[PDB]
Amino acid sequence: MKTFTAKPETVKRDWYVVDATGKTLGRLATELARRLRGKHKAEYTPHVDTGDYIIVLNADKVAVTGNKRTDKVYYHHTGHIGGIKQATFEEMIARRPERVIEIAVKGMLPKGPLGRAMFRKLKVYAGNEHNHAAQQPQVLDI
Amino acid sequence: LWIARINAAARQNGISYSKFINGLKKASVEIDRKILADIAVFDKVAFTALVEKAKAALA
Amino acid sequence: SRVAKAPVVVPAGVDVKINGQVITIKGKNGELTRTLNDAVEVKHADNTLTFGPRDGYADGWAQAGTARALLNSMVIGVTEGFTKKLQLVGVGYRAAVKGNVINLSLGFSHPVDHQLPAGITAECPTQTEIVLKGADKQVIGQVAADLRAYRRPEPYKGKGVRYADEVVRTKEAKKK
Amino acid sequence: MKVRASVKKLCRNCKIVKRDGVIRVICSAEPKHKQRQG
Amino acid sequence: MIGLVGKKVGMTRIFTEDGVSIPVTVIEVEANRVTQVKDLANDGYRAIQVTTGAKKANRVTKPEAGHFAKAGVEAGRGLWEFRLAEGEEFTVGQSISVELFADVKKVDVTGTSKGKGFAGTVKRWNFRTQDATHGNSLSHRVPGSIGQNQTPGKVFKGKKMAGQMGNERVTVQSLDVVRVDAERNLLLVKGAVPGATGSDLIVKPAVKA
RNA sequence: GUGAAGAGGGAAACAACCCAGACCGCCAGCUAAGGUCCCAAAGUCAUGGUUAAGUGGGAAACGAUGUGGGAAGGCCCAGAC
RNA sequence: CGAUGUCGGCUCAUCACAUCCUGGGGCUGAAGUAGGUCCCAAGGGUAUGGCUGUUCGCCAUUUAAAGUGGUACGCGAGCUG
């Protein structure tokens, strides 16, 4: 008989809310990805996560090691007439301020459907207007 | 999978799995083998007092 | 190091004002002449000035030397100001003013037609000479160089704006 | 003006001062001596 | 800043004292009925439902009938909701006449193109056929070489090949105003307009101007 | 010497290089070459030096108040830069 | 070698610039109009006839331009042959 077994129905989640304002992205990404997968709790299999539900409200007020703001391109291949189009970090954080935090934790999380199940526990905003107060999210400063 | 459950508790105590296992191997009849290592989730006050017993044999 | 450790010395007929941030100087030229710093402090003892970093910051006497460089010319700016240097030479090239708007003749279909920033206005005593009415070494340097960009000297003619900080030259002809 | 990583001083009028990250050379009347980098 | 809808009655030539005949299109613009004014800025935006014509009551279902009922007894088809930004309009339901263009010089018109069906590459993309003189057989109305020889392994998306033409939305970007008379429902414009009965002819002032 | 007639571990894939030799199993443990930031198992080890470059992870010439490391001198408080 | 269609042209362009034109920046041993030259932006664009089957070649005429380099010395379940 098996010592312990991981079961995804048995895993329970509650709501949390974090600060992104003035935070260094190199620390925010590692702690947020570990939180989202439960890799700050007891662990077992990599095929079942032990995370929780997480809100980000001010997702573009972060600070970075990116010192030359006209570098990076964010290319995405769709196959339309062989084309690709570039955007800088300074223009990307203006078009999609809610996306930078997600592509930052994408480097700490597995690919495909197992990754997408964790990306449903993370929710993002940049207008800093709270909406889920009926769920009572737990406030975290670090 | 037992390594993951032990390393998670070692990290939540400020010690590494490599040091935790090596300290419990430097003491006699203390390693107790991973097949009984449910003490990594049973109680953390006792796990902290096991990490300090391993530190008293490691160094 | 040495320039941040210079006392500056305030001249006569001048008034100093400060409120923990932004130092203001007043005299017989200009209006509301003052300069800002956000991590450097500037203070006045009774005749001598001191520059240094705020508590929880350190400049290595570098930015204090940059703040000194401006305030040490502001004390001249309010007492005697700066000399005449900007001129233009060549056939059909003339300088004039209407109201406070310049009428600068340089063979263009637009005579620059501009009035400059605030605390700074133009005057022309003669069609060859431009006078700058101001008290800030920075804005008088910038507007004199904003004008220098218009009709830059042609290599074999050497005609246009002269400005005393460099020599205007003509290229030697072959000559045919 | 030649694109190069090294400079030559060939006239005594040149001041040879470091300007925005590199050594440079220029002469008051002769464009032949203007050099962007050393 | 918004637009109007009105029906085409024909095309002609006005004749002018510059000798040129100036081809002109005639549109009858009955006042656009206004079914709702949304000045209250719900969800952070303002709008107006300008409305023109009505659909036969045997082909108007209750989900649509209750969407016109609060401004009249007639209902259906073109409601035409336009958004309002940097401009104040009267807060209460009031119809808008073609006098909206009596201080406008230039306009544009958008509608629906004629049905051209099946088309093929040549009639869709106005493409060069292959010559049938000095041989060539079994295909002449094809573009030739849809990819760059062997190393692509694939064709790129959205290229100038195949597809069907017409029966879709189309804009004519610049027309001149000639005469406006709102007592006669008259709009007279210099130019021609796309499509027949499928075309709604949404006319707007120039936003470049 | 490696294979051909030798499986396995490292070198991204990878008989030629590195390691080591394949009877079976374990409600059992250690090691070789090589690994240990997130993926994918284990040091985000401890300490003596170096670095702003992506050298790390193609390649000469050359200069400098970018910086780290030495020795011998000149100019100098019978006064120097 | 138990299967690897050949030359130019047409037809389709494609992808680049060690840039042909256009945009912008400097020079000439550049008076202006000319002739000669260094190089940022790859964003917009980059010839037809004569003789010949012709790459090459000479030869008539344009364009803001007709230049450098790759693609089975670029296209055959493409055309010409």
Place this chain on the structure above:
RNA sequence: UGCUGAAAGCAUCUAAGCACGAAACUUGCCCCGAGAUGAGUUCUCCCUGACCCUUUAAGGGUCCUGAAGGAACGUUGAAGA
């Protein structure tokens, strides 16, 4: 291309504080676009029966009853294989 100017008694187009600097770029014009499973914003229409079962917060029956809406049927097409 330059202004003011520090690291650096002197000097510097750069470090801090700044003004200029292109056809393009970003905004802008227009068509398409929620498979954006991230499934968004807003309006409009409509349904008022009763009992029962399960290792019964989810499924499954009996008897009554059938809105908003859809399709079928059909005369024609500036819509169409």
